[PDB]
Amino acid sequence: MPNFFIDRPIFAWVIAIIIMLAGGLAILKLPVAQYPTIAPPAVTISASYPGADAKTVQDTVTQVIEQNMNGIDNLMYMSSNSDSTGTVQITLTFESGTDADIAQVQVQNKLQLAMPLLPQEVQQQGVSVEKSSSSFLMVVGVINTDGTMTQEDISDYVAANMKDAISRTSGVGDVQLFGSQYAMRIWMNPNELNKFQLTPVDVITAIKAQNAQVAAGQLGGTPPVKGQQLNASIIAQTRLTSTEEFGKILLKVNQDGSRVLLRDVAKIELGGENYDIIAEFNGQPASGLGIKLATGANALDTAAAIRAELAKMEPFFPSGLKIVYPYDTTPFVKISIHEVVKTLVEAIILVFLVMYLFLQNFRATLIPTIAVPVVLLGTFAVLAAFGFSINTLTMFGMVLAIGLLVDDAIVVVENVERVMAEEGLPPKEATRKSMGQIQGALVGIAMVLSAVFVPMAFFGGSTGAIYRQFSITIVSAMALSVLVALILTPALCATMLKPIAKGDHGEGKKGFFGWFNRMFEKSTHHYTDSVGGILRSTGRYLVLYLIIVVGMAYLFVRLPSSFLPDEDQGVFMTMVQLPAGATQERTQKVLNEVTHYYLTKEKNNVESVFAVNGFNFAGRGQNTGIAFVSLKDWADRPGEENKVEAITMRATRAFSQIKDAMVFAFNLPAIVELGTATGFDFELIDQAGLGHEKLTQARNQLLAEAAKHPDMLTSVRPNGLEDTPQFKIDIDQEKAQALGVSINDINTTLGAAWGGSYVNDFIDRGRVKKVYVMSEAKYRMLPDDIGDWYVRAADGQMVPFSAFSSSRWEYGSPRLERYNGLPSMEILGQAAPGKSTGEAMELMEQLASKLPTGVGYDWTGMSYQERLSGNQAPSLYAISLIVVFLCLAALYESWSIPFSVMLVVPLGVIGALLAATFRGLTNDVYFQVGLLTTIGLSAKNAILIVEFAKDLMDKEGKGLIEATLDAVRMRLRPILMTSLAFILGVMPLVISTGAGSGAQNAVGTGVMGGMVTATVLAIFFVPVFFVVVRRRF
Amino acid sequence: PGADAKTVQDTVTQVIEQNMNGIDNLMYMSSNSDSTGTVQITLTFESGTDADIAQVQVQNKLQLAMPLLPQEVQQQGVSVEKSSSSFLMVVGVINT
Amino acid sequence: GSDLGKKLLEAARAGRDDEVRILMANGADVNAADVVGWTPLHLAAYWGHLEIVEVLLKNGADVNAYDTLGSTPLHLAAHFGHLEIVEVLLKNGADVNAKDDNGITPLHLAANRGHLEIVEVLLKYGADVNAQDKFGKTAFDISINNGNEDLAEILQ
Ligand SMILES: CCCCCCCCCCCCO[C@@H]1O[C@H](CO)[C@@H](O[C@H]2O[C@H](CO)[C@@H](O)[C@H](O)[C@H]2O)[C@H](O)[C@H]1O
């Protein structure tokens, strides 16, 4: 095959060209996003029951739905939280590889069927079913600076004007509003309602009567009286359109002739759907747009289009409206592309310099300069063939493979140059010989390298998907590179390369290069002599070798494992959590402080702080909060003291001085999902109808008994909220009936006034918005206010709630969890310093067994995935080993010889482990993918030394030692070059600061150390390896 | 039922259509609202698109719209299906 | 109403016996009330923490202290069925005929939830069996409506 294309460089050129064309094409039609889809498919059902308590929600809504979630395919688990704000979410999480569309429709088809089983006011609100994706492309903030707009005013504007266009914009898949559109608000006054003998109920009846859509019919409708000349539509009462109208709604005609209007017993205004959440942006009112990339789209294009669309909107904004951009993955992703085109260009340059240095030839300088892009090009195509996206992971998968791509070019060319310079052959007859010397090993190398990477594609769940990105990118790059080196370069050499006449090692040459040529030709002898001496005394090194293997082993263990390394992402959060019973006022007092810190004590680094009151990662509620802090460009924040992780602990410290709050800050994780390695996710489960009190108790016990092992379990905590005082009001049925007061009148009056009530819809300026009846706040704050509400009894007499109710304080839950159907309590924690998670888990498991009867437990989330999908790392790598051996055995026609090559592996690992452990880094994914490529190259380098050596023996009839010296001599140069080019190649990443740094550091610093050692050690240890194995057998 | 074209659009067609964006391979989207009270929204997909998957995706987005629609429109049911527009044939039935 | 006051509130409702002891040594408030007027005595009574109740009562805690809705710790104890806590409170001075804002006595609540042992004890400490809520019901009434035959016998 290389001899085929040696006589046919046109064909090769065609193949080359075809590869580039597909590649260039595929570079265009290929999607761009930060990370690909990693988390397995999840679907969330969400509803809201206006004015409901956590139990009411759970018991009328959550249970009924959970109870109907059957017959759905590929479920793994189902979790739900029902809280004090009226909202339930239910999250069904499916197997990896489930079609999310299918999973979503199945879930919704079941919800549909369960719908008539839910309360009126809930089917009325509806229950939305969506895919779970915690990946925003960006977040558009919309604020008002001249204070003429409440956050409601802004939200409505955003909805009415901006939202739909952003929706329609190219590449945007979903758009979410950080507020609600307007709502017609009727703010009842119980004092007025009493002087006119009116309950909330009449107010609701009136509204449904006068804000309605009445069908009429037609004039001249079919069947007609013939001779009818006209057919028209009869158009009757339609929906109300204004506050003026709603206020003119008629409630009562007093006997004296007076009129009672809705505005006579209410204040009426355009308001919000709900008032649970207060959004502020640097202290000013705020709303927003949470925007998500669409499938197969391009983050960059889409982001650009989103901005260009907002631009077109600017001319029409009211006063003091402004767009700002507090979250944008796009400048980030830009940085990642730039840095990887750079690295792929830098490396061609490094290879050019090296190629020219040693080989001193321009016509040869070109061969790798063509081959490498051609391979990188066609790689893109095959990536598109399986439809991957240009993303953080596949891009780094390229830089990691760049070493092997470079190598195959360097190798093939250099060996032709050597064959001439040693035998005085013509370029054509030389390459035929040179290719003949390495071709089989190359096929062999491609197999051996396959068996190193391909297994990694087979890991399961979230992590597996990540490895799979690297695994596939690197196997294709490799295989093209081998194909290219068997088809293109052979031809390119044979037809591009300047002749060399026998013996001419350029020792008799000019200045730098003559000196280099002699300093190198000499150092080749020192090396030769060194190996000869090393071979005279092999025992010394089998001992040395066993020490590196121990060092490797010891180093490995004492290296912390992580998933993906933290990153100054331009933003970070901070959580606030006031205690039970705290008003939203008070929460804003804290939040304004937190905002104050970041704007004062970090004027330098903080551009904005988006404060959200009422929402929190543990729950919803008037006593919770979160602040999104946006930083100035990395170019304006230099030096570790100004990066996220610094500002974090500094802000966490200052906030520990906050009197009655729980306030800290934290950085987001890389990929928004997988949480913590060493970290676990635990579900305590009520398997026998024990109830809340008993479950809180079993929880308490499990927590307390976990706190008594700080050597395994650390930071073991409840995920949910704690019970809080509730106001229990008891209706006296007897006295209600006896006074002539209805239960339903009583209850509707209570709930409408105190909780609100969705009456119907109306039309505001062409858009359909909701109508809400509730008490004006000053009549629904305190318990004394309850008896200020009057309900009309059948006899027409006005009766105060004080006369048929009783009230007491009692504790209940403001958030109630469930897991696979049963009540539950979620428990978080991590493995203590230096322990594994399966250890910390095993203890939790052990500790849980001693819990009260009826209490069970399950592992969810990352812990679920671990408990089923980490065990493969040995088994998969055992397959590797076996195939690797098998291939090598096929290659060398020897059950024995393969050991000589396989032994090379730790020589690569030890430097990497040294280099990581040095810097203070981790055994994370990039590190591990870097290990494999380090190991790959060294395995390759070895494969060639062995093959040449063996070749000399079998063919030229040389001795063992004679061939190992000669081989190792021949193979010295191309190993120095490749390394030289690669170590430099990765250097930029090694030292990088900020802006996608943490990642580059990980891939780089573990490739560098590993390459250092695998080069130094292998040029001495591999010759030893061959000899001892050939001796033993 | 009984609602005019402008009503049927403002309260239904709009609501649905504005939830209808971000679906795989969607070329264009025509719709209309007559005076009987009838909405018809048609999404056309790139040639090659799996028709059944297309339907499912539209089904899914329509869910988000359902509750926002008027009570009485949900009472009628709202269908989602692969569609045509051309009559293959017209079978006539008469009495001799 | 202080750093330790609130701290004590936390400790009593969760029943961290030791942390209470320390706070007690430190002079933490025994009249620290939350937003609903519950003192650490109420908290310990509602949640059934006998050691704490005994401890707090030694440290001058108010046993007839009362929430914003008129309810003393004895109520919470009687209602939620902690015999031992009821006895202690009573022995330590508790008002057995205390009426919350609805006119509901601790007898009433024990009656409703049918904790008869608590009823006898309250009866033994001289609870007015004839006392009636805002709706005018006796604990006997509560009993016949709930259909507790055994309990109604006692209340005669
Ligand atoms: C070009 C040549 C290179 C090809 C290399 C790729 C081939 C890799 C094969 C894919 C393996 C799939 O992964 C599959 O996972 C399950 C895990 O429940 C394994 O099953 C495992 O069960 C228990 C788990 O407690 C293990 O201890 C056990 O060692 C193993 O048998 C299977 O043995 C494996 O087949």
Ligand SMILES: CCCCCCCCCCCCO[C@@H]1O[C@H](CO)[C@@H](O[C@H]2O[C@H](CO)[C@@H](O)[C@H](O)[C@H]2O)[C@H](O)[C@H]1O
């Ligand atoms: C690649 C970049 C870095 C370059 C340099 C880095 C440091 C490593 C240097 C190479 C080490 C090997 O160096 C080599 O060791 C052996 C010993 O085992 C020596 O060999 C000598 O010592 C041993 C015993 O002590 C004798 O059996 C042997 O007959 C004798 O000649 C060689 O004279 C020396 O050249």
Ligand SMILES: CCCCCCCCCCCCO[C@@H]1O[C@H](CO)[C@@H](O[C@H]2O[C@H](CO)[C@@H](O)[C@H](O)[C@H]2O)[C@H](O)[C@H]1O
């Ligand atoms: C010539 C043949 C080549 C074969 C040589 C073998 C390759 C060695 C380097 C790659 C290591 C692969 O990855 C290995 O398993 C898991 C992968 O999630 C890693 O990290 C961790 O993952 C899982 C799940 O998150 C944890 O349960 C586990 O505690 C831990 O092992 C380890 O850090 C690493 O030891």
